[PDB]
Design a binder for these strands. Sequence first.
DNA 1: CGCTAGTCGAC
DNA 2: CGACTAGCG
Length: 348
Amino acid sequence: GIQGLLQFIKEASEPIHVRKYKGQVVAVDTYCWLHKGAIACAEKLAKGEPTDRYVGFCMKFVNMLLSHGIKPILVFDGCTLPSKKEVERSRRERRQANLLKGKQLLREGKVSEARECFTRSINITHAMAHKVIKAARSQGVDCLVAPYEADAQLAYLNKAGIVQAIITEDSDLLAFGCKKVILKMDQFGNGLEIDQARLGMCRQLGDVFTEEKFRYMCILSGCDYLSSLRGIGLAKACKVLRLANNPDIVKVIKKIGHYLKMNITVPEDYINGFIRANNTFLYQLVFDPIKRKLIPLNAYEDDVDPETLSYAGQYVDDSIALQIALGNKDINTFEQIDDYNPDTALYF
DNA sequence: CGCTAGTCGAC
DNA sequence: CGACTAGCG
Ligand SMILES: [Mn+2]
Ligand SMILES: [Mn+2]
Ligand SMILES: [Mn+2]
Ligand code: NA
């Protein structure tokens, strides 16, 4: 989650409509619709009571995309990436804390505060996601569960040419290298569009419109993989990459004080963490729908060594990866919950 | 000015 | 898993 990236490159945005992508294919970060739909029924989820409103909430958007002649591909989150496990456990503690706090505020009579706390404790399980999967497949909509983050999966789908745009609310997709990203889309088809090619319209960027420099900037600003240094944000990082001509990022980071004229002390931890975050943004494991195989987001460069990228995701057998991608296999228990087969009728 | 961190919407 | 803004370098 690049803190305030949208406001920073606002000059590259454009109010559009989904009708623009008629006859084409788009992929959706379904967690957004799932979350927003889960907000509507927070109490039943917090109490464990049966509910199915978020499903219809997703199906509204889905039926809209279908009505405007668009081909949607719902992408869901899979396994938890080790690089973002600290934040994961943080939210894991916070949601349970807010859960118990909600259960306690339920006894004080303050129902509004209890619901307000039940809203900030929403946990999107893979069972709900699976419900959305089956419900979407009922309408003939192709689904795909990412081996890890849905961000990398959507990124691959957009960069490979399977889809032409990505529907989401997360600006991380821009740092992954998505060509076109649709944001702020309502249930009618009204949203914003941030095109990569139009990043040059942002004067505040300068010569930082290339994918590599944009990535470096996003990481230096502080991502979900590596926390930024105390005092460094988007503008100062952009300034660093603007005033620097050296392609080797390591020396640049080592002289970040020389570029910004600030007494900045850079630990080795932040260097290794930077290389780590970069390798996570570049070579995170995704799943090829057509060839049915676990692949990195981008082709392995000569300067990198795949054996030292466990944090970017661990490899498993492609059959298991297929069973996870289809949603037949549970993400946690690794047990077979469903038995869907695309061979009996995206993948083809 | 730019950035940290707290804060409140979403439905 | 954002947007807005007070407090601060
Ligand atoms: Mn994020
Ligand atoms: Mn995500
Ligand atoms: Mn993300
Ligand atoms: Na920052």
